[PDB]
Write a protein that binds this ligand. Sequence first.
Ligand SMILES: O=C(O)c1ccc(-c2ccc(F)cc2)cc1
Ligand SMILES: Oc1cccc2c1CCCC2
Length: 181
Amino acid sequence: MSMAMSQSNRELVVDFLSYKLSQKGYSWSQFSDVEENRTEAPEGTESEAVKQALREAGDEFELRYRRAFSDLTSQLHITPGTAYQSFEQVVNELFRDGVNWGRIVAFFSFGGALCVESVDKEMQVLVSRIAAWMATYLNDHLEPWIQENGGWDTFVELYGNNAAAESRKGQERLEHHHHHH
Ligand SMILES: O=C(O)c1ccc(-c2ccc(F)cc2)cc1
Ligand SMILES: Oc1cccc2c1CCCC2
């Protein structure tokens, strides 16, 4: 069978996380050390698209929601006290009106960003904790809806593409300048 969603959640936040950490020069394997096997050219399949889509869509949300991304971190001061409680309270903001592709893409970058900051200063120990909170929320606290709507292939096919993907950014000028009455 295909048995999708078998383990593309725990390493889903770490995959996008490293993509944002490598941009700063923090990496991830050095976060909690952990035994480093190797992984030279295991191939595997690398046919995932949610990662690529989450990349472009990542900066996408960072442009229209400028006011919505102002009271999301201010109420998440990293400190030796709260962690999943306040975190789930903030992520719930996007997962409240109703699980949606956008609410699922933004919450993604919201977590990967919370770690990029904690690691930017000097806290590379709470990265697995935050990445784990989002890993569970997607393990069984959202997957059931990701399929009810259609599947990652939907949000990844609607935008995840090389560049064309039949864009529609106000593309209402052609129409032969005289073919729509
Ligand atoms: O598609 C949606 O419904 C949707 C609505 C809002 C947001 C969003 C994204 C980033 C924020 F900091 C706040 C809100 C994402 C998706
Ligand atoms: O569906 C969309 C259409 C336009 C922009 C964005 C999304 C979804 C998440 C990223 C931002």
